[PDB]
Every structure is written in C-alpha cells, then in structure tokens.
Design a protein around this ligand. Structure first.
Ligand code: MG
Ligand code: ZN
Lengths: 189, 109, 97, 97, 375, 274, 317, 45, 288
C-alpha cells in the first residue's frame, strides 16, 4: 500500500478493533505507520496532508490546492492547515483536533489496557492507494516436475511450475561456509 | 402423553380402600419447586421399567393442603411407597433419591 | 515549560477542594442556575433527603454533549493545561499569525 | 535464586533453544568443526540403516545428539521430542504466530 | 486443654441437623425487584416463573458447603446411613472441605426412608413404625469435643420436628451455651406448621428463647406476628407497597433479654436488621439467570446465611455495631447472587421440545444456547 | 516480531509443495492410505489430517533462505520452519542487516536440504546463532537497530537535573527509598512513580556503578563516629571500625529494568541447561 | 445507596443511529478497570442478527445485469448486507421478497418469520423501472463477529454475503475527580452508539451480564461423561470404589478413621486430609509437625493397622 | 557480574557491549540476551 | 460439554514468603481470553486487601538520627525492617500491637503481641538485634487496606513516625494465550500465573479477584423501588425601537431564535436595558 508522497509499505498484521489504538472521541484508528521514516526520506508533505484531511472530514470540505503556495507569503501552508484545524475544533466541539500546546498532535490510548500513551501523537486522514503487486501473484512452490529438453534442467517461471536458480554468487557463499555436501546436491540430484 | 397421571385427593382415598395387586407410588409435588421437576423425570422412567407392574400417581400439594397435612408431608419432594398386603407397612422417602434405590424398594418392600 | 504547567495544574486541584464538586463542574453546565455553595447543598439534604451525590447527578442531566466534550480536559488520565482550555480566540490565532 | 524466572525456563526448553546450547558444548571439545559434522552424519546413517521404521517423526540426527548428552550426564529427552499436554483433540493445530 | 495447640484462627462453626439432597421446607408467595421492560422484549427466550414462590432456604448440609466455599471452618453433626446414599453424601461434604468427624453412621437405620403405619380413616399416617436415620439421634452420640472448640452453633426448626430429636437438639444448644457459643437459629418453617400462627409460636418458643441471633423471612414474620398480607403479589411494577420495613414496635413484642440481632429477609432484594438501639435496611439484585430447576430460590437462602456467619465469626466484638452490620449485609447479598447464578449454570435447563438429547441414567438437561433454539 | 532467532514462518501452501514426498510416506506408514496414488488424492482435498502429518515431518528439518543479490555469505542462512497461515514468509527482525532486507516489496527464496549429510551441515554450520560476527573486521552484525534502539535510549535517557526540575533555588528550602529492585519495578506498574522520577536503591554488592572520578560533595561526620559521604550518584555510610554499613544508589526505574533483563537471561539459560 | 447510576442523555438521531450517556463515587483504581472491560465487551461480545444467503432465481452470475432493475446483482447483494434485524433466538430462518411493477423494493417488502423483526422500514434494496416481477429468497442467522464467505461452492441460485453481526457502532469513556481530598474518589461517564437493533442501555446491561459469565467459572469446583447432572458426586464415587485399589484410598478421609482430636486437628492443619496422604508421609515427618509427640505416632499406627494391613511409606526401612 | 550503567545508550554503545558479551560468555548466551533486549526495546518504544 | 472448566497445573512453595501457582481455563471463543486476562491481572494486583504496619512509636528518645544504647542498628534501619513484616488479618478498623523484650543479647523477631484476629506469617523475620542489656519497648499500629499505599501524613504528636505502606498481597501476575484452531473453529486457553507473599495462597487470591470483579459490575444491574424558519428571521425585520435594538445587538442576539432562547432574567444583565422594554418586546412578538 502507498500514499502519494513516496511512502510505501507491506501489510504485516490485521488486528481486531478492540486492540487498535483509540482517540478521545472513542474511534479507533485504521492504520498505524512508523514515524522514523520521515527523517530519512525527507517528506514533510505527508504531515501537512494528514492534518488537513482530518479537518475536511469534520467540516465537510474538500480542498484543491495548487503547488508552490509560498509565493504569496512566508509559511503559507502552515497558516492554512492550522487555521482549518481550529475551525473544525470550534464548530464541532472537539478540542483535541487543535491543541494549543502541541498543534497537530493529540494524546491517544491503548486498546489492550486502557492506558494513555506517554507522549502526544500525529493523527490524520490521508489518502492511501493499493498497488498492483499482490501476494497471490507472487507465491510459488515446486517438487519434481517437468524438465527441459536439451539442458534437462528444471523449467523457469511460476507459470511454468519451475525451479529457482542457484547461481554464481550463491555458490560462492555456500563455499565460504564450507558446505560441500549441500552444494553437490543442488548441482546433481 | 404421560404415563403419570394427576389425581384428586378424594380419588386417592378410594384407592386405599380398594384392593391392589401392584405397588402404588404417590408423589406430592408443587409447580414452584425445582427439585420436583427433576423428580418427575426420574419417576417417569420407572414407569416404563415397571410397565404395568405398578401404578404411579401424583397430587399437587397447593390445591390439597389438608390431605397432605394428614399424610404427614414434611417437605416438598416427598414420595410414599405403599403395598398390596395391608399389614406390611408404607415407606416415605424425603428428598431426591437415586433411581436404584427406588428400584430396590419396590422389589423388596 | 513544564514547571509552569505543573504549577497551574496544582492550583486547579486546590480550587476543587475549596469550592466543592458541584461548583467546579458548573462552568460546564450552563443550565444550572441554582446556588452551589456548600452551605446551599446542606440545606437541601435537610429539606429533601438528597445528598451531594444525588445533586451532582442531577446537574449532569442538564448538560449538552457539546459541553461534555469540552470538559474532557479535566480527565485524570490526560489532563490539559488550564491556560489552553480557557484561552480566547484572538490569542490562539497568533500562533499562526 | 531469582524470584520469577519460571516462564523463561519453560520457554527455553519448549522453544528448542536447548538444542542450540548443546551444539555449542559439543564443539568445545573439537578442533575442526568440519570433522565433527562428518562424524555425526555417519552415526545417523548407521542408525537409519539398522532400524528404518522408527524414524520419520523422530529424526536420526537428533537422536545421535541426545544420546551424546545423556552419556555425559545431562538428561535430555529422546530426539528432543516433546508432547503438547493441552491440545484440544485429534486434528487440532497450534498457531505459533 | 489442647486448645492452644490445635484450635486455629478461623473459629469453628458447627451446623447441626439433617443431611438431605434437594429438600425444600416450604414455599410462599413473593415479590422481586426486576426490570419489567427487559422481560417484555425477551419474552420469548427467558424463563420467568408465572407465579413466584420462594423457598426459605435449604438443609443444614447446604449451609455448611457454602461456608466452606467462602473460607470458613465448618463441621456437621448428625446421623446418616452406611447405605450407599449415606456414604455418598459424606463424600460430597468431605470433598467440599466440611469436617465430618462429628457425623455418626448406624447399621440398622436407613438414610431417607421412614417406615410408617397406614393409620386411621382419613389416611392419618403414623410415622413411628420406624424412624429414619436422620431424625434418630441420641444424646450419648453428641460429640462434646467439637462443641467445645466451636464458637458458633447453627440449627433449624426441622430437627425439632421429631419428638426424640427435639430433646437431643435442645441439649446440644444448652451444652454449647455454657461452654461458650453464640447460637444462631434459622426458623425455616416446614410445611406442617403453617396451619395456624398460634400453634407455631408455641412450638418454637423454647428455641426462640435460647438464641443470640435469629433469622426470619418476611412472610414468616408476618405469620408469627399476625399481620395479613395486602400486596398484589402478581403484577408488573415495583411499588413499595411490597418491600415494607415494619416499624420497630411491631417487632418488639418478640424480644427476649439474650437477643442480640434479628434479620428479616425479602430475598436478595432487601434485607432488614433490627437491634435494640438501631434499625435499618440494605438493597440488592434479584434479577438473576433463572432456570426451571432453580426457580425456587433456595440457593440464595443458603448463601445469605453463610455470609452472615463468616463475618460475625471473624470479628466477634462488633455484632452490634451499626457499620459492621451494614458491611456484613452487603457481603451477604453478593454471596447469594453468586450462588443462584452458579446453580443455573451447573444444573442447566430442561429440554424445551425436540427432546432427542442423550439421557443421563436418571434425567436429561441442556445448556442455555440450546434452550434458545428456533423451534 | 515474536519469532525467535532460530525460527522462520513458512506459508502452508508453499510447504505442502516442498515437503510432499515426506508427507506421502507418512500417510502410508500410518496406513491412512493404500497407495501413492491414493495419497495424492488426500493431499488435494485438503483434508484436516494432511495438516497434522505436515507438522510432524517438518519439526526437526531445517530450510534455507536467500535474497537475490547475494553479496556475502550472510545472504544465505538456515532456519527451523514454523507453519503459518497466510501467504508471506515471516522473518526475525535482527537478521535483516545480513540479508540487506527491508519490508517494502522484497522477496526471498526457500530450499529444502534432502540428505542426512546436508541436513547436518545446515544445523551445525549455517544457523544464526553460530554466525553473529561479520567476516571483514570482526564486528557484530546483529545488533538492535531502529525502534529497538529508540526504546533503549528512552529507558536510559535520564531526568531533568537542576533549573529544569525546580523553579527556585533549592537552597531556601528524590524521596522514594526502595529496598529491593522488584519493589521499584512494581511501583512503576501501579503508577506510584514515573520512568524518570529519581529514587534510591539499596545496594548490597560491590560498587560497580560507572561514574566519574569525583570526590565527595559533602562528608558529614558525627561525634559518636559514623560518617555519611554524599557523592552525586551515591551515599556510603561508614563507622568507626571503618566498615561500610550501607550503600545507596540514586537512579531511575529505567536503569534498573535493563540490568534486570540482562541478569535474568544469564541465570535462566544456566538453570535450563540443568 | 452510595454508588448510583443514571442515564444523563438519550437521543435517536436516525432510525439507524442511537445515542446514550451514563454516569456512575467510585474508589481510586476502580474506574479504569470498569471502563476498559466495558469497552471490550461492548465492542466484541454482543451478538446480532443478519441475512446470510440469498436465492435469486434466474441469473447466470452475480456480475450480470437484469432488465428493469437499475442495479446489477452485485449491487443488490451489497444493499442487502446493510439491512438491520432484531431477534433473540438461534438457528437459521427463512424469509422472502415478492414485489412487482415499477417502483422501489425496500425493507418493508420482506416478509418475515414470527421471531425476526426489521428496524428501519425505509432501507433501499433495489430500484425498479419497468413492469417486472422481483422474487428473492433469504436466510437469516444470529451469531457473533464477522463471517468469511467460505462456501463459494453453492446450490444453484444461492450466493453468500459477509455479514457483520456487531450491533454497537462505537463507545467512549472518561474519568474525573470527585474532589474528596484524602479519600480519592472518582466519577465515571460512558457513552454508547448503537445501530438501533438494541438500545444503548440494553447494550450496557447485556455487556455486564456477559462479563459476569466469563468470571463466574472460577468459583465453580476444579476439574480433576455428562455434565449438568445432579448426581455427579454419587456416580463418580460408585466408580471410584469399584474401579481401583489405591484409588479407593482417596475416598477414605482422616475423619472416618477415628483418631483422638489433638492428633486430628494437627494433621488437618498440616495439609493432611486423606489417608493416601498419611500413608505417604514419613514417620519422621510426623515428628516434624508441631506439637506432635512420640506417643501419637504409635497411636496412629495402632489404629491404622487395625483398619488395614498396608504401610506404603508408613513402614520405615 | 556486570557493570551498572547510569548514562545513555546509543548505537555505538550497544555494539561495544554485544562485542564484550560475546567474548566473555560466548555466542549462545549472547543470542538469548539479544532476544530479550529486543522485547524490552519494542515494548518501551 | 463446552463448559468452561478451571484446573491448577503447577504449584510450588519456595519460602514461607513466596508461593507460585499456574492456572488454566477451558476453551474460549476468540477474543475472550485477552479480556479475561487483563481484568484479572488488574484485580489481583489492585483489588485484594492486605494488612500491614502503618505507624511506629519509639518512646525512648526524640532524636531524629540517634542510635540509642545497645541497639546495633539505626533508627532508620529498624523502620525499614518493620515494613518488611508480613501479616494476615481480617480486621475492620485499626488496632494496636507492641513488642517488649529485655535482652542482654537480642534477636528481636516474633515478639509482637497481637490481637487474636491478626496473625504472623513468618516468625523468623528479624526486627532488630540488641547488643547490651536494655529494655526495648515499641508500640505499633496495624491496618487493612487494598494496596492503597498512603494517606496524607498525620501530625507527630509524640515521637511517632509514619511508615510507607504497600498493602499488596500478590507480588506479580501475568497472562498468556494458546490458540488451537483447526478446521471449522478456533478454541483458546488462558494461562494465569500468580505469585503471593504467603498471606494467602495463589488459589485463594484467584478466587478473591474473581469475586472482587463481579461486585464491580453488579451495580449496573441494580433496579430501585418506585413510588427552522425562525433561524432566517432577523431582528431588523421585526420593527423594534432603537434603544432596544442597539442593546440586543450588543449582546449578540441577531435572530429570533435567539431571543426565544434567552430568558427574562438573562435580559436584565445587558446594560442600558429596561423592564418596560421587556414588555415591549413581548408585545412586538405578540402581534406575530
Ligand atoms: Mg526494499
Ligand atoms: Zn507550502
């Protein structure tokens, strides 16, 4: 799954709603992402997009913004996001949407124990997409099977029900270990 | 249908006077009591096992308070086992009692 | 920054103790228009038999959901700075300019 | 004795970490690892040649290793094989996430 | 004087009487606090007895099994059979940690069977042809040592029904009082004695006199005292006409110099206490899972009694404190509700229809999910 | 994350393919099928028994895993397979550096070692526990790396010391004292204290605390003969006979938690061997 | 009494959305335990009823289309997955729809059995724009959680839908201080949102009962062929005495083999309740129990031997 | 027999410790220590 | 038949002060096990009630930091030694206890004089050691509370020093799950481990926690005895005299809906307003 700012990941676990992290409104978050990714990958765009999404959902607005907004003024994007979050907080009376001490972040709780997590966290509704590369297409296995005409070796390809390659680099690694018997097997039987 | 049949107080009187050739078992019961609902089930089995070698009848205590006081009911789940030879005595059993015990009494008393 | 929030939070604890439970929580119920002094509460117990707790429960029955949601800053688990809660609109705007 | 180590000890035995510890003891008696691998392989072959049908869920390599440890004084089960005391019934599988 | 060496902290309590399996002394009309609206919505799947009748309580073995569960040290004194039933009954008690040293077993007598003479016209039976083992206990067999160690004695009116046994019981009570004991009397009036009030008061007056603590159901209190009920007894609302606290004066006719407390029970729904200087009540839950087998409400009775015993025994100095008594009463309401609930789960429900269930050698039962099946 | 170092999770569909011959034998040996053809049918209907047999067969049999650009030996390592439902292979968090793997689209390959000779070599020479040091200079290859490091840092980070903790000079005018480490860990759970709150712990052992070479801030000496020495992180109480009556350490709950885990693991491994 | 509960607010926003808020002086740690358990029970332990299979009479597949209906078969099936129903009984039940002509087929058009009842009455199943006949067959069930559509293989005309049987949409809780000074007491508030199959107050009660049923098992007797029988103790013993020697030994208790009281009391305290226990324990061990003499070991052995010949550990070497 | 540390742990410090533990206790013990530290790190984070 | 059952699988008594038990529960439907475990662990660690020594009164001296006479130990060390003493009781209220020994050589341990209800779990625990003949007299106070560590410290009327009390009987508790699902359905097993201080057995603690939990959720079941066009109309349109209009607009009333929301008492707060005016507004509305 991926977002529009260069962020990609593979799903690892699905958990029941009761065990998911939850907000001061009671609702449970749909996805949880690692936060150590942004410093390395340099995308601060996502933080601006998640926060604006939360506002629009609450106030019933969609926003279409053209690029390079700072031409008008310094820190233009911050002024848009922070202002909109405040309006949502006031109109629907949810004070957690804009918190004056740490704007954009809130305090959430754990589903398993009911206890508050210690430091404030970033919550938002971004837009996430599902990619064409799926597990079902990827999985393959083989035992026995059809063999090629001249080389008399196994066939290549999942469609063709084939084997996998032990190539030059792999031999070298097996040699480093000193596993002669294992290697001979791959080359003969 | 049920082999066990509810009977009025008066009718029971008639039975005591008249002759009998198979053992009568009388159960005093009440709608409210929980043990008695369980008891009814076990007596019913015995009816099948004896199969016309006995008569089993029931009287509801709440309707016939006086009849009961006379035959000395002490607590609700009570069974009186009576016999044809009118010199041999009666047996009163109080409380839920296992089936094998019920069986023995009919045979040996 | 922390030293100061703690000081403000301790003052709130003290006001609840002096004023009483019904008075502190009445900022957030605006439909209660009845005396909330400790001395007013005792008089009602003598006259009608309803103690402090019963009176507090009756007050909350007059609160709007919008107002309840604003009272969550008073939660023991995740308490909010008393200054942020009561700040005016003009002041907040200056965060973004 | 540290007071609460019970679970960790149950797990070490159950997990199969015991085998790892054993391999290490045994290699502390040998200059060439490569030769020890060859000696163990030979013993396993003798065992399977002599009684073929015992094996299949009991593995020969494990048997050779358990036998070494028991000879030297540490009680190990045969072939490091442990039953599941609490399985619900036949045809039931544990989910070892 | 082996006391120092062997007595132990939880003081021993001794329950005297008859051991029986599932015996109900009596049953009278009653009312309960329930949510009437839920009952309408769940009419299809909940058993609600049509006319509600509540048993006073159960046999003394039942009170003892209950104390043991809560943690008390308990002993049962009485006589039983060495016939199979008897030996099995002793096993139950033993498995449930009730000391059985005081019980005595006899070869000739039988466990629940009383041979009776056919009697005069009108079927008036005579029960003296042969007494049953339970009511056949003699003064010689009473175990003095158990009586000596114990700081509480519990007895019921059932053991006062047979003529010889009455005598034995009164002796046990008097022996205990001297040695040092608090006597707890539970009037759980059986079926015969409901004919008239005057007769009842006279039958039990000697026992009433010898007791430090007494427990009476509300319906019994009215019967002894005189009041005739004026409550609907079959309606869909909780109205306060029921659940009345009789004023202290109505109760005062029955006091004696040695009576420390009187407990009047309306079920787990309300429990009332009367002491010489104070009077009060505590309230509870009676809307509990009920099955046809458990509708009598006997189990709650035994549980309530057990809680009152445990608490009074552990801190003896405060039987008359206003606060302790209120805390005791709340623990009792809780023990009662737990017991009625547990029973329903254990015993189960009778098969509704489509009774093709496997049958135990004596009877058949199903779980709640099963009861609630579509047709 | 929950897997141990010696284990890997293999999807069941992949396994049935790789271990088929072994399962057929089992079906026949247990006489749950008459012929090889008979068994292959049972495998297809996915009958529940096929699964009990599969589990039995793979219990002591290792498997080999490799990533595509196999730059160095650590590219291939061996694990004990654990059946999992789902279609992806689960890998331990700490083996990813060697394989140079991340969880954004990377794929891996599995091979099964058929001969006895081959099987011995894999358990004895190609498992992670045996290969914890890299070939080039001798450095550790499996060390806590990202989130795990964040957690360790937080536990040992510490507490505010002066202006940050007190507004006004302490002159004009922490408290908890605990006797055993267990109690302290307990208070954290019961919310009596926080992770960073300072505390005093009695130490019965021998001055192992890494601290600077600093002389005492104040020595307080009394007439009957006892002297109390206050250093920054410790208080040593001594008597006329020159014996150390007590030592107390100033610390935080987080520090005691890391020590305890390292210590308990050592003792646990020892008690298991026996 | 001291603890009191009430419903502070109740609202019905739509026929399919309901709301409720409740209030509860509680001691210092009690509120958190009550709140977490209630959330987990409300979102997780309450069951509901839903349509599980549909029989469309003459369609090749679900991705087809039919004339006179603006939606495909897949769309009609999705719309059905959203219908709200109320029932208290288990098992499968059958119902049908048979409207004709131009118009809209809505929830009212379903004919139901006696036990199941619809809630909304306005939910839309399909849009019909020609004079056509719509006939469908439906199956309804009560269960918990969610169902994967496992039986892809099906009888002709039958297609399954993944039902979600959860009747509570959302929940929240909050804890505040009662300001009682030294005694720290607290006030709890809970809020519940429901689909309207059941009221929030009913959900609150159902959750409490379900929780007690999960903690009550512990207070039954420990497990050590049919349950739910009054005579489980009797039948068990009948086998225990008949079946095995050394197991009959469990039946015998120290109480029956009469002993003098001083000895009996001491033995019981030291965890000895049965004979197999006494025989197992060493003679030396008896000296270990406090206030146990030399005369007593003799007494016990003398009474025991009369009762039975065996000395399992009773006999010293 | 280990040192008590009263200052922070950063990545350099963990590599030094794992190295020091491998030399004193060996690879088997170190593997168990490592799995346990991982659990603690994930939990606190 | 699908009936939940509980068994004890492991038990061990290490010292008189440490006990361990492991328990199991029968198959549970998915999702059930974790809820049951979390709650139990909370009850065991916080709801069970314990008895311990809250306050100590040493009559011999008033010095805050002075070793007195024979005793080999400090005042503070004795206070620590006293806090580590385990007791079992069923008290309601408070009680007093004392220790008095006159020993040339002393191993003060188990000399506490207690009321019959209170009991001592381990006799050997060492309160103090006296090197020279002297008379030692200490008075103590004992209480029963559910692990609530403290109240505000009270006044030191005499040399009476408070002791910080941990009232927790159970030392640790943990839970685990195994899921054994095959074919049609999944079943789970809960495993609970309890360690105790010897005041109660682990099995007893298990039962107590279950009872404590049930009483917490019983209160919910208790039953008591029984005895917009306006939005779009603005004040400008309904003619109103100027002084009243300016005043209302001052206080943020802009539309009719809003005047209705306001009440007669509320109006008298805005300044420059008059009671007669309240009548006039009523008259204007009256015409509608
Ligand atoms: Mg990648
Ligand atoms: Zn910008």
């Amino acid at each position: 799954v991926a977002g529009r700012h260069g962020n990609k990941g593979i799903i690892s676990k699905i958990l029941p709603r009761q065990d998911m992290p939850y907000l001061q409104d009671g609702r449970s978050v749909d996805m949880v992402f690692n936060p150590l990714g942004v410093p390395s990958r340099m995308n601060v765009g996502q933080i601006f997009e998640c926060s604006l999404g939360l506002a629009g959902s609450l106030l019933d607005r969609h926003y279409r913004i053209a690029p390079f907004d700072e031409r008008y003024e310094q820190e233009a994007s911050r002024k848009l996001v922070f202002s909109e979050l405040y309006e949502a907080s006031k109109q629907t009376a949810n004070p957690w949407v804009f918190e004056p001490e740490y704007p954009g972040k809130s305090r959430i709780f754990d589903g398993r124990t009911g206890n508050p997590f210690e430091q404030p966290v970033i919550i938002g509704k971004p837009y996430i997409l599902k990619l064409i590369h799926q597990v079902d297409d990827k999985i393959h296995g083989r035992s026995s099977g059809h063999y090629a005409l001249v080389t008399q070796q196994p066939l290549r390809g999942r469609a063709k029900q084939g084997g996998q390659r032990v190539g030059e680099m792999e031999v070298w690694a097996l040699e480093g270990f000193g596993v002669a018997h294992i290697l001979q097997e791959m080359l003969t039987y | 249908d049920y082999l066990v049949k509810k009977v009025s107080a008066k009718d029971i009187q008639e039975l005591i006077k008249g002759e009998r050739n198979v053992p009568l078992i009388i159960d005093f019961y009440a709608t409210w009591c929980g043990p008695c609902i369980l008891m009814a089930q076990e007596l019913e089995m015995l009816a099948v096992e004896y199969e016309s070698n006995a008569l089993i009848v029931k009287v509801d205590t709440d309707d016939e308070y006086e009849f009961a006081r006379d035959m000395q009911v002490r607590g609700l789940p009570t069974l009186y086992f009576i016999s044809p030879d009118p010199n041999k005595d009666a047996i009163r059993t109080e409380g839920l009692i296992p089936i094998q015990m019920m069986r023995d009494i009919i045979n040996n008393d | 920054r922390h030293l100061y929030k703690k000081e403000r939070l301790q003052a709130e604890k003290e006001k609840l103790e002096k004023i009483g439970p019904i008075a502190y929580y009445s900022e957030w119920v605006q439909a209660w228009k009845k005396d909330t002094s400790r001395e007013a509460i005792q008089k009602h117990f003598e006259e009608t038999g309803e103690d402090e707790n019963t009176q507090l429960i009756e007050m909350f029955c007059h609160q709007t959901d919008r107002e309840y949601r604003i009272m969550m800053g008073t939660d023991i688990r995740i308490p909010r700075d008393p200054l942020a809660m009561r700040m005016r609109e003009d002041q907040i705007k200056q965060i973004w300019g | 004795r540290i007071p609460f180590l019970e679970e960790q000890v149950r797990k070490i035995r159950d997990g199969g970490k015991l085998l790892t510890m054993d391999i290490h003891r045994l290699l502390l008696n040998e200059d060439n690892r490569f030769d020890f691998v060859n000696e163990i392989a030979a013993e396993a072959k003798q065992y399977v040649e002599n009684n073929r049908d015992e094996y299949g869920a009991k593995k020969a390599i494990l048997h050779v290793l358990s036998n070494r440890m028991n000879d030297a004084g540490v009680y190990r089960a045969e072939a490091y094989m442990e039953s599941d005391p609490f399985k619900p019934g036949p045809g039931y599988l544990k989910d070892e996430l | 004087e082996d006391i120092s060496f062997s007595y132990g902290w939880p003081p021993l309590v001794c329950c005297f009487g008859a051991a029986q399996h599932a015996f109900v002394p009596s049953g009278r009309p009653s009312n309960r606090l329930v949510d009437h609206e839920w009952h309408e919505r769940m009419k299809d799947a909940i058993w609600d007895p049509e006319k509600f009748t509540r048993a006073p309580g159960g046999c003394s073995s039942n009170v003892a099994v209950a104390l043991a569960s809560l943690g008390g040290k308990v002993a049962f004194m009485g006589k039983l059979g060495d016939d199979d039933f008897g030996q099995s009954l002793v096993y139950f008690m033993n498995i449930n940690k009730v000391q059985t040293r005081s019980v005595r077993l006899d070869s000739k007598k039988a466990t629940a069977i009383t041979h009776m003479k056919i009697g005069k016209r009108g079927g008036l039976r005579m029960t003296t042809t042969k007494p049953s083992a339970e009511d056949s206990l003699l003064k010689s067999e009473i175990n003095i040592d158990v009586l000596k160690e114990a700081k509480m004695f519990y007895f019921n009116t059932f053991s006062m029904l047979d003529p010889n046994m009455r005598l034995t019981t009164l002796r046990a009570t008097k022996i205990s009082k001297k040695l040092g004991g608090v006597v707890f009397y539970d009037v759980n009036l059986p079926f015969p004695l409901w004919e008239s009030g005057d007769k009842a008061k006279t039958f039990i007056q000697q026992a009433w006199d010898l007791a430090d603590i007494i427990e009476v159901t509300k319906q019994e209190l009215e019967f002894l005292c005189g009041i005739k009920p004026s409550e609907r007894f079959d309606t869909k609302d909780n109205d306060r006409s029921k659940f009345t606290h009789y004023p202290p004066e109505v109760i005062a006719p029955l006091w004696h110099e040695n009576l420390k407390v009187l407990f009047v029970t309306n079920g787990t729904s309300k429990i009332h206490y009367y002491t010489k200087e104070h009077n009060s009540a505590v309230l509870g839950l009676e809307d509990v899972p009920l099955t046809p087998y458990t509708s009598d409400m006997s189990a709650s009775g035994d549980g309530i009694i057990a809680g009152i015993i445990r608490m009074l025994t552990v801190q003896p100095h405060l039987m008359t404190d206003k606060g302790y008594l209120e805390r005791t009463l709340k623990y009792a309401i809780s023990c009662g509700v737990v017991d009625q609930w547990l029973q329903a789960r254990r015993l189960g429900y009778p098969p509704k229809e489509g009774m093709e269930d496997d049958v135990v050698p004596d009877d058949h039962g199903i779980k709640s999910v099963t009861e609630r099946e579509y047709r | 994350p929950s897997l141990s170092l010696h284990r890997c999770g293999l999807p069941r569909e992949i396994a049935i393919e790789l271990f088929q011959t072994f399962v057929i034998r089992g079906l026949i040996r247990q006489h749950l099928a008459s012929n090889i053809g008979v068994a292959k049918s049972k495998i297809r209907e996915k009958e529940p028994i096929v699964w009990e047999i599969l589990q039995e067969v793979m219990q002591g049999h290792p498997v080999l895993l490799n990533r595509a650009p196999t730059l160095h030996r650590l590219g291939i390592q061996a694990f004990q397979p654990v059946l999992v439902e789902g279609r992806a292979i689960c890998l331990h968090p700490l083996v990813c550096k060697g394989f140079n793997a991340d969880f954004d689209g990377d794929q891996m390959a599995v091979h099964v070692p058929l001969s006895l000779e081959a099987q011995v070599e894999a358990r004895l020479l190609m498992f992670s526990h045996m290969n914890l040091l890299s070939p080039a200079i001798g450095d550790p290859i499996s060390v806590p790396t990202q989130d795990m490091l964040i957690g360790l840092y937080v536990l040992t980070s510490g507490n505010h010391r002066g202006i940050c903790v007190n507004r006004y000079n302490p002159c004009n005018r922490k408290e908890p004292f605990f006797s055993n480490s267990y109690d302290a860990i307990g208070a954290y759970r019961q919310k009596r204290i926080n992770l960073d709150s300072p505390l005093w712990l009695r130490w019965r052992l021998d001055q192992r605390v890494i601290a600077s070479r600093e002389t005492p801030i104040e020595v307080h000496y009394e007439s009957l003969g006892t002297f109390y020495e206050i250093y920054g992180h410790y208080l040593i109480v001594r008597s006329l006979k020159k014996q150390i009556l007590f030592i107390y350490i100033r610390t935080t709950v987080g520090h005691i938690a890391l020590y305890r885990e390292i210590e308990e693991a050592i003792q646990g491994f020892s008690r298991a061997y026996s | 009494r001291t603890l009191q509960w009430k419903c502070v607010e109740s609202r019905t926003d739509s026929k399919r959305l309901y709301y409720g808020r409740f209030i509860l002086p509680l001691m210092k740690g009690q509120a958190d335990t009550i709140g977490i358990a209630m959330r987990r029970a409300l979102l997780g332990e309450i069951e509901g009823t839903c349509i599980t299979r549909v029989k469309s009479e003459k369609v090749p597949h679900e991705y087809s289309t039919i004339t006179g209906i603006q939606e495909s078969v897949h769309e009609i099936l999705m719309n059905l997955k959203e219908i709200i129903l109320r029932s208290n009984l288990y098992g499968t039940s059958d119902a049908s729809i048979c409207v004709k002509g131009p118009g809209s087929v809505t929830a009212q058009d379903i004919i139901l059995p006696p036990y199941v009842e619809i809630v909304d009455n306005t939910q839309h199943i399909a849009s019909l724009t020609e004079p056509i006949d719509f006939c469908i067959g439906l199956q309804i069930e009560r269960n918990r959680g969610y169902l994967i559509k496992t039986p892809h293989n099906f009888q002709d005309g039958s297609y399954p839908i993944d039902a979600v049987f959860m009747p509570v949409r959302n929940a929240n809780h909050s804890i505040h201080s009662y300001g009682n000074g030294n005694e720290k007491q607290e006030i709890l508030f809970l809020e519940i949102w429901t689909n309207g199959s059941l009221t929030p107050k009913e959900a609150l009660h159902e959750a409490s009962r379900n929780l007690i049923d999960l903690f009550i098992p512990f207070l039954h007797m420990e497990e050590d062929t049919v349950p739910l029988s009054p005579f489980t103790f009797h039948d068990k013993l009948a086998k225990l005495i008949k079946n095995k020697k050394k197991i009959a030994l469990k039946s015998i208790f120290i109480d029956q083999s009469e002993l003098p009281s001083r000895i009996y009391n001491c033995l019981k305290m030291s965890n000895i309740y049965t004979l197999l226990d006494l025989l197992n324990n060493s003679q030396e061990d008896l000296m270990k129990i406090e206030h146990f003499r030399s005369e007593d070991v003799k007494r016990i052995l003398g009474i025991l031997e009369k009762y039975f010949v065996i000395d399992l550990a009773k006999n010293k070497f | 027999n280990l040192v008590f540390h009263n200052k922070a742990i950063n990545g350099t410090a963990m590599k030094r410790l794992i190295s020091r533990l491998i030399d004193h206790f060996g690879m088997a013990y170190t593997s168990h220590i490592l799995d346990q530290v991982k659990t603690l790190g994930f939990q606190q984070a």
